Amino acid sequence: ERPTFYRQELNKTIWEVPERYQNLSPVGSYGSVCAAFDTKTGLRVAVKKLSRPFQSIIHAKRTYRELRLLKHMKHENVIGLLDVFTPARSLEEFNDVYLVTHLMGADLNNIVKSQKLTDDHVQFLIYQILRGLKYIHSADIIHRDLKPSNLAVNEDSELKILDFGLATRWYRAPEIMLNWMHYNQTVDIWSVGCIMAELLTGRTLFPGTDHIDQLKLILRLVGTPGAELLKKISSESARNYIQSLTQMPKMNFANVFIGANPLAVDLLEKMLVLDSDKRITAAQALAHAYFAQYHDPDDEPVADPYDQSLESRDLLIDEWKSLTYDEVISFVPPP
Numbered sequence: 001e002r003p004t005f006y007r008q009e010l011n012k013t014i015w016e017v018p019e020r021y022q023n024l025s026p027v028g029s030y031g032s033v034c035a036a037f038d039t040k041t042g043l044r045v046a047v048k049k050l051s052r053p054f055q056s057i058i059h060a061k062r063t064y065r066e067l068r069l070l071k072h073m074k075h076e077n078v079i080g081l082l083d084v085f086t087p088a089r090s091l092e093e094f095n096d097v098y099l100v101t102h103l104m105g106a107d108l109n110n111i112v113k114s115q116k117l118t119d120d121h122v123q124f125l126i127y128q129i130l131r132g133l134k135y136i137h138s139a140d141i142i143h144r145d146l147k148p149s150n151l152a153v154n155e156d157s158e159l160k161i162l163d164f165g166l167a168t169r170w171y172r173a174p175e176i177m178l179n180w181m182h183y184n185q186t187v188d189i190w191s192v193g194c195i196m197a198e199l200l201t202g203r204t205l206f207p208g209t210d211h212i213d214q215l216k217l218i219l220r221l222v223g224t225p226g227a228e229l230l231k232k233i234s235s236e237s238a239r240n241y242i243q244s245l246t247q248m249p250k251m252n253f254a255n256v257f258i259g260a261n262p263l264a265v266d267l268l269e270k271m272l273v274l275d276s277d278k279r280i281t282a283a284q285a286l287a288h289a290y291f292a293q294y295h296d297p298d299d300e301p302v303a304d305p306y307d308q309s310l311e312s313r314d315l316l317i318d319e320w321k322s323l324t325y326d327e328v329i330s331f332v333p334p335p
């Protein structure tokens with residue numbers, strides 16, 4: 001049975017939603033988001049209305065990509081779908097897509113507020129990110145822009161990784177900062193280390209003022225490339241410049257993170273290595289003794305493989321639109 005919808009105009013735009021979704025209230029901004037109450041489940045939800053979903057080939061492709069990812073993501077620490085709907089009774093009138101998920105209510109700034117968390121709290125939060133990253137990475141997905149605003153947290157400090165959240169460079173791996181084009185999964189591990197550091201200290205690890213200051217600040221802490229790492233640089237210019245650099249020594253992290261759990265420090269040394277091939281993975285981080293009170297190797301699930309070649313095709317608008325439509329139709333709500 002097609003549910004009954006109703007119109008309403010929020011934050012200067014019309015929203016058409018099923019009746020189960022009551023008390024819509026804007027929470028901010030590829031779409032706008034309202035908090036709402038789901039009378040069917042009894043749950044507070046975030047409802048996202050996609051912005052101009054089928055206006056261009058590029059918008060259509062993105063809508064399809066977002067819809068497909070979110071439908072795939074089914075893990076406690078990763079944002080997924082409670083519902084996806086359209087007013088449309090058929091493909092001919094299909095022009096809007098609404099996405100529904102748990103309202104978390106806060107991201108990792110509202111929960112943190114620039115202060116030191118306790119070690120226990122830090123463990124809990126980083127464990128959750130890594131548990132979610134393991135899941136993500138097993139589907140062969142690199143996040144690439146992990147930061148506090150891309151991490152949704154509720155009151156009980158239960159955390160979910162967000163595709164897109166509601167200073168944006170402080171958490172970027174050096175190789176992303178330098179527009180390398182062969183990233184590995186440990187670009188996300190770098191971002192986790194920056195986040196972990198800040199939760200432990202109350203302070204941004206690398207608050208660069210601009211692009212170059214950021215890299216300066218990273219080199220100060222991790223040192224300049226060693227010889228094994230220079231051997232992996234294909235760009236002659238990059239190579240030349242690094243070789244012109246005055247060798248800088250890697251700092252001792254026990255002196256950077258004064259009074260932190262020695263296991264936290266050890267873990268940060270394994271996350272924040274210049275050479276991405278030498279960074280601890282999310283699976284390995286989960287087994288690190290720092291997360292002893294939370295680690296359960298039998299409840300750290302992995303994803304089904306995800307076909308991302310389906311989203312990087314070159315299709316006509318009406319083809320993406322029709323493919324996106326079928327995804328809406330095929331959607332099965334979680335238990």
Ligand SMILES: CCCCCCCCO[C@@H]1O[C@H](CO)[C@@H](O)[C@H](O)[C@H]1O
Pocket residue numbers: 069070073078079136141142143144161162163164
């Ligand atoms: C929905 C649960 C989180 C999934 C994380 C994927 C977020 C996708 O975000 C995308 O990630 C790509 C990485 O492949 C980047 O190259 C893109 O620029 C970015 O748009």
Ligand SMILES: CCCCCCCCO[C@@H]1O[C@H](CO)[C@@H](O)[C@H](O)[C@H]1O
Pocket residue numbers: 174175178180182183184225229232242274275276277
């Ligand atoms: C002068 C500043 C040096 C920045 C060097 C970044 C080192 C990151 O490490 C490198 O990551 C590359 C991209 O993912 C990989 O191809 C390499 O295997 C890896 O060593």
Ligand SMILES: CCCCCCCCO[C@@H]1O[C@H](CO)[C@@H](O)[C@H](O)[C@H]1O
Pocket residue numbers: 178212237238239241242
């Ligand atoms: C992977 C290595 C990337 C090369 C980074 C380029 C650094 C540019 O950085 C700038 O370099 C200028 C000339 O080099 C100088 O005027 C400045 O001292 C410096 O800030």
